[PDB]
Amino acid sequence: AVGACVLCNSQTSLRCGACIRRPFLCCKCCYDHVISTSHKLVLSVNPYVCNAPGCDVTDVTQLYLGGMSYYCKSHKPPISFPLCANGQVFGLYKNTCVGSDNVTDFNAIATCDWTNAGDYILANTCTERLKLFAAETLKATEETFKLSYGIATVREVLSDRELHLSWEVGKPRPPLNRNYVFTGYRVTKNSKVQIGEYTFEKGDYGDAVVYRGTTTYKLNVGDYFVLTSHTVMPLSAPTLVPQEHYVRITGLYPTLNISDEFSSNVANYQKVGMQKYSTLQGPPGTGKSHFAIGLALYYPSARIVYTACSHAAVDALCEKALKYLPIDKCSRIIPARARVECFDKFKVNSTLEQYVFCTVNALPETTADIVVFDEISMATNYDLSVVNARLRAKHYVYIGDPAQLPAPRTLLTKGTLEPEYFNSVCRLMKTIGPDMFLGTCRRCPAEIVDTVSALVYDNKLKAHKDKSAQCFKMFYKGVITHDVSSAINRPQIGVVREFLTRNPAWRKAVFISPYNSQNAVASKILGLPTQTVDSSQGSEYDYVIFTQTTETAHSCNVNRFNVAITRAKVGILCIMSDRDLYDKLQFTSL
Amino acid sequence: AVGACVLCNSQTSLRCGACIRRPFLCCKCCYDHVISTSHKLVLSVNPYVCNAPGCDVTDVTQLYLGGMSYYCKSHKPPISFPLCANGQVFGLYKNTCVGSDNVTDFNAIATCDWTNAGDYILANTCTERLKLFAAETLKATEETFKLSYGIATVREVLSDRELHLSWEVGKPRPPLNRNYVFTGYRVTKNSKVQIGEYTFEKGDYGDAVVYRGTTTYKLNVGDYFVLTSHTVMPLSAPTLVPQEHYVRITGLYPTLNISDEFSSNVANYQKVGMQKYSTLQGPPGTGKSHFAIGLALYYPSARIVYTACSHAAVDALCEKALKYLPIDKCSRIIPARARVECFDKFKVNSTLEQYVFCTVNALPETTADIVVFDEISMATNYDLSVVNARLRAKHYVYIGDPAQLPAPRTLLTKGTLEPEYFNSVCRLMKTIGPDMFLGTCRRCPAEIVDTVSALVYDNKLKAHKDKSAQCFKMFYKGVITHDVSSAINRPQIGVVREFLTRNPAWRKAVFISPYNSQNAVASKILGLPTQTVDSSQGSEYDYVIFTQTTETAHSCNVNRFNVAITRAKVGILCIMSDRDLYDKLQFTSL
Amino acid sequence: NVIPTITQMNLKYAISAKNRARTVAGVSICSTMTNRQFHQKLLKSIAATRGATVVIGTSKFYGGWHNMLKTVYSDVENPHLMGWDYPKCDRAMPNMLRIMASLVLARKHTTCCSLSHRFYRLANECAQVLSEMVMCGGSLYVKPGGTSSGDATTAYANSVFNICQAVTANVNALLSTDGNKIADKYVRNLQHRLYECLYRNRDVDTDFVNEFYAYLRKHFSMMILSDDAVVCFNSTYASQGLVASIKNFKSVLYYQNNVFMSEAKCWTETDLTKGPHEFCSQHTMLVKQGDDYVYLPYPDPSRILGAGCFVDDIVKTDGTLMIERFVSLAIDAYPLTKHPNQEYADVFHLYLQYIRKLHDELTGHMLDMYSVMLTNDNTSRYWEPEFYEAMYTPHT
Amino acid sequence: FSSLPSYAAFATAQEAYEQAVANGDSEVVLKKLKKSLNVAKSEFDRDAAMQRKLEKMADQAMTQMYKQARSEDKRAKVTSAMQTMLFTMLRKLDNDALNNIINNARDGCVPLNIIPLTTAAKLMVVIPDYNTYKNTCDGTTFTYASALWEIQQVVDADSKIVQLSEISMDNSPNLAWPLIVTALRA
RNA sequence: GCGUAGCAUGCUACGUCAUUCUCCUAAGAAGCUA
RNA sequence: CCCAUGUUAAUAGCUUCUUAGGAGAAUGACGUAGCAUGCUACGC
Numbered sequence A, B: 001a002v003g004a005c006v007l008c009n010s011q012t013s014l015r016c017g018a019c020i021r022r023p024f025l026c027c028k029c030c031y032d033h034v035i036s037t038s039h040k041l042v043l044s045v046n047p048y049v050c051n052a053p054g055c056d057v058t059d060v061t062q063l064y065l066g067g068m069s070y071y072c073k074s075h076k077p078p079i080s081f082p083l084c085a086n087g088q089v090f091g092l093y094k095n096t097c098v099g100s101d102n103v104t105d106f107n108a109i110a111t112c113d114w115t116n117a118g119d120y121i122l123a124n125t126c127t128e129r130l131k132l133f134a135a136e137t138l139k140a141t142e143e144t145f146k147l148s149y150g151i152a153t154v155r156e157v158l159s160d161r162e163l164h165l166s167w168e169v170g171k172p173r174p175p176l177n178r179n180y181v182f183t184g185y186r187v188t189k190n191s192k193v194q195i196g197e198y199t200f201e202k203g204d205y206g207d208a209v210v211y212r213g214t215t216t217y218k219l220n221v222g223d224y225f226v227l228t229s230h231t232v233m234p235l236s237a238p239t240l241v242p243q244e245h246y247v248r249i250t251g252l253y254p255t256l257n258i259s260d261e262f263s264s265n266v267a268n269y270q271k272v273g274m275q276k277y278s279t280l281q282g283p284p285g286t287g288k289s290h291f292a293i294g295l296a297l298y299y300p301s302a303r304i305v306y307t308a309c310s311h312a313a314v315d316a317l318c319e320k321a322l323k324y325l326p327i328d329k330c331s332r333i334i335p336a337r338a339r340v341e342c343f344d345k346f347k348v349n350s351t352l353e354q355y356v357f358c359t360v361n362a363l364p365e366t367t368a369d370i371v372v373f374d375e376i377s378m379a380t381n382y383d384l385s386v387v388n389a390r391l392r393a394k395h396y397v398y399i400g401d402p403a404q405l406p407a408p409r410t411l412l413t414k415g416t417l418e419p420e421y422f423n424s425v426c427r428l429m430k431t432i433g434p435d436m437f438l439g440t441c442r443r444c445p446a447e448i449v450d451t452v453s454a455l456v457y458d459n460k461l462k463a464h465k466d467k468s469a470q471c472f473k474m475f476y477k478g479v480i481t482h483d484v485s486s487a488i489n490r491p492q493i494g495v496v497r498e499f500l501t502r503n504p505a506w507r508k509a510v511f512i513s514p515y516n517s518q519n520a521v522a523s524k525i526l527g528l529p530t531q532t533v534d535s536s537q538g539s540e541y542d543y544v545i546f547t548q549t550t551e552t553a554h555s556c557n558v559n560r561f562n563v564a565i566t567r568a569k570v571g572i573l574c575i576m577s578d579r580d581l582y583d584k585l586q587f588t589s590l
Numbered sequence C: 001n002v003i004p005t006i007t008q009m010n011l012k013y014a015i016s017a018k019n020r021a022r023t024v025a026g027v028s029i030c031s032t033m034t035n036r037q038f039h040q041k042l043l044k045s046i047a048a049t050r051g052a053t054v055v056i057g058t059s060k061f062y063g064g065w066h067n068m069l070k071t072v073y074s075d076v077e078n079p080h081l082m083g084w085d086y087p088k089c090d091r092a093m094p095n096m097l098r099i100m101a102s103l104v105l106a107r108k109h110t111t112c113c114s115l116s117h118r119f120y121r122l123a124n125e126c127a128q129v130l131s132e133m134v135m136c137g138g139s140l141y142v143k144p145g146g147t148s149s150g151d152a153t154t155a156y157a158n159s160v161f162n163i164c165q166a167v168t169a170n171v172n173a174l175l176s177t178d179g180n181k182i183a184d185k186y187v188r189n190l191q192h193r194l195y196e197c198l199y200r201n202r203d204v205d206t207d208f209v210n211e212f213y214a215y216l217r218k219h220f221s222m223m224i225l226s227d228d229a230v231v232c233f234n235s236t237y238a239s240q241g242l243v244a245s246i247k248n249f250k251s252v253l254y255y256q257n258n259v260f261m262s263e264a265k266c267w268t269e270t271d272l273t274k275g276p277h278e279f280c281s282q283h284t285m286l287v288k289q290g291d292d293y294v295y296l297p298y299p300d301p302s303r304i305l306g307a308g309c310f311v312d313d314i315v316k317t318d319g320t321l322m323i324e325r326f327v328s329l330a331i332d333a334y335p336l337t338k339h340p341n342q343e344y345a346d347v348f349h350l351y352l353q354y355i356r357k358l359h360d361e362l363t364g365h366m367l368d369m370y371s372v373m374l375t376n377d378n379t380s381r382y383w384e385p386e387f388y389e390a391m392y393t394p395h396t
Numbered sequence D: 001f002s003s004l005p006s007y008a009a010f011a012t013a014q015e016a017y018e019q020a021v022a023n024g025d026s027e028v029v030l031k032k033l034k035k036s037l038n039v040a041k042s043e044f045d046r047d048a049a050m051q052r053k054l055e056k057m058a059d060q061a062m063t064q065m066y067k068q069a070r071s072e073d074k075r076a077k078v079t080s081a082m083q084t085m086l087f088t089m090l091r092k093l094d095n096d097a098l099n100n101i102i103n104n105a106r107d108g109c110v111p112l113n114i115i116p117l118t119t120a121a122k123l124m125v126v127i128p129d130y131n132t133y134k135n136t137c138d139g140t141t142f143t144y145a146s147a148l149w150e151i152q153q154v155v156d157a158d159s160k161i162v163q164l165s166e167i168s169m170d171n172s173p174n175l176a177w178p179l180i181v182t183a184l185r186a
Numbered sequence E: 001g002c003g004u005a006g007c008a009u010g011c012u013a014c015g016u017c018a019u020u021c022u023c024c025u026a027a028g029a030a031g032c033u034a
Numbered sequence F: 001c002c003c004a005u006g007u008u009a010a011u012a013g014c015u016u017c018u019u020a021g022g023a024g025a026a027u028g029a030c031g032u033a034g035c036a037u038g039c040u041a042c043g044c
């Protein structure tokens, strides 16, 4: 087929078959891409290989057109000619092709490995059509890296609520959470097919897993769970729409007598109503999801699609929407696979509803009035382009916080990524400044929020709350078990249980730690509700049990530290094992 | 691409290349046109340029035909023969062509720049196909003169309805009114894109250019404005459909007991029935635009299209039809763009109603049974050609007077155009005399007729009124300020403001001034409805406040003055500037 | 698998002599593709065999009509020509005879297809052709049966049906004769063996099938083009009742087609030097050509003038653009020159003079539009009669 | 050909030949130069006809590549059109009654001819004259396929709406028959 | 008499250029027949 | 020193004609190599 070259936007029919994505390149650009890197195979409407019954020379420089086909230098017909010549590669639209000298940057994108953080920062400063390409090939590379994971199958049939794993020998083990699912396959004699998705969590002790089946046809031992890497569709729409300020608000008809609670941001509601897309930088727990609720109320005769990256963000937003917005004109869309049970108090899958809450991956093709995308630091440019492709609306509002943890970003191991390169929106917030800023927190007490203000902001955090004398940071050396792919501090849980007897406050508490293995084992010896820092960042609670396992760069992340300390409202039993990580906060020594 | 020669209607395939309209030309006529003037480029089915690899010879006297292409003298193959030879430029249908002698007139029409006085008298006494071609090339010249105006650029945005503009250096400023629409741009790096169709008006205080816009975009500093130019559509229909005196009335059925008001007009109705097109000439306010409604009420089965070149002439017709005709079976046509507001009481934009009303440029292609073209003095041969191309009908009635003010003819600066050159129909009324004539002023008080039957119409008017004692004309010099090209006179607005607190009944009067800008600027001091003399032609008012702005050739034009003062139904105040004209009328002194 | 298929009914826009509308069933490409692959080898080996009964693919030009008419008369003893006419051939044709036609066109697949493959191809023909869903102006109706005129095998399935009705007429005519009156002791024994092989055997008797087919070719020679048949039957036999005359076809079409074939549409030509009275809408006459006598086909003159005067597109009215249209019409109307009615023989010279006038005014206009006539111009032979007479001489 | 060195060799051999003609060398040398000019012209002929054949073949391959690209783009467009047609005809089903009758079959197969007859919501009756109209759908409700239908519209052959007060024995001539009466399942 | 060189003439091979023919295919316009 | 305007067309067969590509042939012509013989310049 024919299309448009990525780095010059000229009509072509050539595409480097050595890239994982096969991007369209014109004559000159493809010539420059094959002459430079190790990319050699080129696909036209037919592939550029030696099309003799016996040969395999799959480069383009060595290849000669003869008759109606292509041959190597050993089998070529006496009549000419090489494709890769005249400064070009023989393809379509040769006279009207106009190249560009970006092929060094394009080669650097196509040659990278996503191990350095230099690849990620180069994959964010390029032009828009290369930003899409980098996001697409990065998603593909991470999906290939996920695919090569060791299989599991049940030992034998045990129970409805507790099975037991058996892995392939000596392979990497997937992180066990609600993000990761398996599929059971049925190759029994007889037609390998999916028996259903399985969601796995760690159980009480040993090699035990609490399991959730999607299709409940109970399995035997021959049906096996695999990580099932799934297809990634291409993307077309830009990461952001082009901005266009308006003199006055178009089509958004404001109402009167809104409320006195969120009347303090009607100026920022209007400033949203003016421009095309808006950027709200909310400090941790400053009414950011509250802002979008008040926005939906200020222009209530409009249509809003709330969109979130992770399920937890739209879960918190659905709770707040039930609280303030009228439930009757509001639908929460759940994907049909039903892998994770969403917050269902709205009508499920009413896409024509006035206000629709959804994850970014399962968005229906709709036109809206203003679409509010939520928690942008979780999202990568793939997500922003997906929401721009599926959802067309008169206004776009991106709310989030650079001071949170980014996308999980598994491929990156050497170097650490600044928030500036998390995605395009977080680049733009850090570049010109955010459109809107919220300024008075309502979760932390004053001392802890002042610790936040001195840490990552320019002394701009304050909170309308006073301390409960229940902000702890224990002194334990933190013996790490490490009998697992992650790190576990079960003696830190021993420290927690040998304390907290004289402090009975945090007994409905949520357990927080940067290591999900400690979260997994924590819910077993004691009946504690636990959720890691990944399942944090959207979940606000009053009583908190935090543990810091090691003293290293994993626990030294300042954004993860900020989002960890900003979680607790009235009572925090926290263990900080690092002296420096106890030195920068004013907490009780005991 | 064959066609018909303009000046002998032979078949042909050539087109002169230097003429703006590319008139088709037969072979002998094309030789006569390219051997006398400097129009040496000719296009056949392909152009007559030299098909060398690189050569620039276009002069048809030089080229040769060889093989299947036209080569200059220094690239001809030896099998070749000259085009511009034997007195005939070679084209298709070479030997079936009839020469002509009008190539001493077609050259003057196609060559001149339309600025002198004689070119319009030559564009109106030639043959019919030359009348159409001359009108077409005059329209094209007036369109490409608009490219000579300056280019605007924003300096700052004082307010959302108040821009600030700086014009290009060395190029004349366009006049700022709703005739001339501009297009915006933001061309910096970054979006060389139109950002809306705007139009301007000079705000009263400061150098503020209050802009109206189609869009709702915020304007930056760098946004810059280019005037739009409309392409001239080519025209085909004759200016005057040939007359055929019938024996008896066809297509029209007269009425029993029409009215007591149109009882004296019955003979002219029978004459309109008998002829094909008829022309009516009367001095102002003597029943001309009334006669058209009487034609409506004398042939009630006859579908009628009323047309004029202004919008206030067709609105005066609309008001008269509202008073007399049934309002269910009537209509009114407004164009979609519509920078000016029109009459809105009929079912707008419903051309199927029995009595349609329109401006001549915006007519829809339809039929009729008698079509009434009011105000032929404001019509050019382009307008009569358009009304003959769209509207197909059985009878035509052209109503109007040559002694009112004509189409403006912006290019005309050196000379004066007598009435018999305004178009073809005004020539017919000043060559052989009008078919129907009614002079007796049934509108203006006898003082107005007494002073206007001595200026233009040499003592041929008597009024069906008396001296109504409300005709005041004063002489105040009025020290002028200058706008873009349309002067503005503050102290005469001052004396009018004095004549508004001290005469209470006159607060329904209409302001009449020869300049558009003062007409806009005296609304913000006085608040009266405002009308310019050029666009006031055909609609009457109870009281009229006329203010001669400047002593020039435009505002001291006796036809402009006549159409200014003959619109007052009962009372008029005339703040004069010229001494002799103030002595020419015979009002009260004031 | 069975693929049912919707077939449109298109209204035909072509010149005709009677005012009933004519419709053609446009069959879906999902059916036409597969039926082409299934039947194309046989259907292109019927059109490439000369001298057989099914004369599809034998041209009437270059002495083809003479050769068709000479292989009909393949030594029948006292020939009479006979021609019949199925009324409503494509609508009255029962489902059983269409299934028989599709089972005879699929006997060639003894090796390439299995048995169930041939059954599912039969079911696909009966679902896409025989009793399909006809779409007739925005509405799906059920077509009850009988062939649809647009599938991949319609002239040939029609030819099989036509041969089947002629053989059934001969079987009925031979059995229904008395039997004591049959004087020829060979033929009476053939009637006896024929009844026994019909109603007293369950296995096909290839000896007698060959012998009866030899009898039919010896005394009932046929020539078949999809339903136009010319038969050259022995006349002494058909008078004695041992071979089908017309009345046997009237009976067979009564009980096996449910139509009554009126004898005012079936001709009988007792004199062989006039040829078939009408076959494929061309009459036949015996002319002298070269040195010997040949048969030539001539059309109906009203047809050729009606194709001149009434054209089905506005641009075909121009004439000068369409000289190939009049060359083709004169090629078709050439043999009218040898017809003895003079007003018939003027149709050819009308077309020749019209081609000459058309070309004269064509070069007139193409000399006006330019000033050079065409340098090479070989239209000068389309108005000589030798270019047309070369189309009916047997050299090529 | 011109950019090939063969053209340069032939041109310089021709220049040497003209210079030797003007120079009047010995006849054996003139024969030698004619021989060299001839072999240069033969090499020029070989290479020039080679490049002409080559560029003809390359333009042919470009044209067939264009044809393949057009065929594959049109295949993509037809696959999109067929898929959207199937999915609109999916959304047009009447899934309640259709599920009822399909789940009432003993195998899961029901003949196609009774899918509309028991699940269609609109019945279009086409009526050729008045006696047929009087017998099949007189009045504003009638019966067909063992249901009751309510007449929602009656148009004529001209797609003009015809009121039910029109269809009478004396106004039967002035109606443009056949009449298409659209009814809904009650 | 032989060997070498050149020249003439005739044949064979190859490279090209024009003319004609035949055929195969592709594409288009048209006519008739069932 | 300036004023009015934008309206649905089937399956199959045969035949005529035109254009393009390829192959082959036939003739002619040029050029190169190879051969047949003759002639001439040199050596033996």
Ligand SMILES: Nc1ncnc2c1ncn2[C@@H]1O[C@H](COP(=O)(O)OP(=O)(O)O)[C@@H](O)[C@H]1O
Pocket: A261, A262, A264, A285, A286, A287, A288, A289, A290, A291, A316, A320, A442, A540
């Ligand atoms: N301007 C405000 N005035 C009063 N309360 C506020 C304001 N903004 C936010 N809140 C409080 O903060 C709570 C929302 O907290 P949370 O659910 O964590 O959302 P967010 O993370 O957006 O703050 C609400 O219950 C609301 O009472």
Ligand SMILES: Nc1ncnc2c1ncn2[C@@H]1O[C@H](COP(=O)(O)OP(=O)(O)O)[C@@H](O)[C@H]1O
Pocket: B261, B262, B264, B283, B284, B285, B286, B287, B288, B289, B290, B291, B316, B442, B443, B538, B539, B540
């Ligand atoms: N027959 C008549 N008798 C008395 N008054 C008339 C007659 N006809 C017209 N008028 C008055 O004279 C005026 C002429 O108006 P109009 O026809 O618009 O004049 P013009 O065509 O010159 O503008 C109208 O206002 C009408 O009231």
Ligand SMILES: [Mg+2]
Pocket: A287, A288, A289, A290, A291
């Ligand atoms: Mg929030």
Ligand SMILES: [Mg+2]
Pocket: B285, B288, B289, B290, B538, B539
């Ligand atoms: Mg008037």
Ligand SMILES: [Zn+2]
Pocket: A016, A017, A018, A019, A033, A039, A110
């Ligand atoms: Zn590549």
Ligand SMILES: [Zn+2]
Pocket: A005, A006, A007, A008, A009, A010, A025, A026, A027, A028, A029, A030, A098, A099, A100
């Ligand atoms: Zn490119």
Ligand SMILES: [Zn+2]
Pocket: A050, A052, A054, A055, A056, A057, A071, A072, A073, A074, A075
């Ligand atoms: Zn190879």
Ligand SMILES: [Zn+2]
Pocket: B016, B017, B018, B019, B033, B039, B110
């Ligand atoms: Zn000119």
Ligand SMILES: [Zn+2]
Pocket: B005, B006, B007, B008, B009, B010, B025, B026, B027, B028, B029, B030, B098, B099, B100
């Ligand atoms: Zn002329």
Ligand SMILES: [Zn+2]
Pocket: B050, B051, B052, B054, B055, B056, B057, B071, B072, B073, B074, B075
């Ligand atoms: Zn030149």
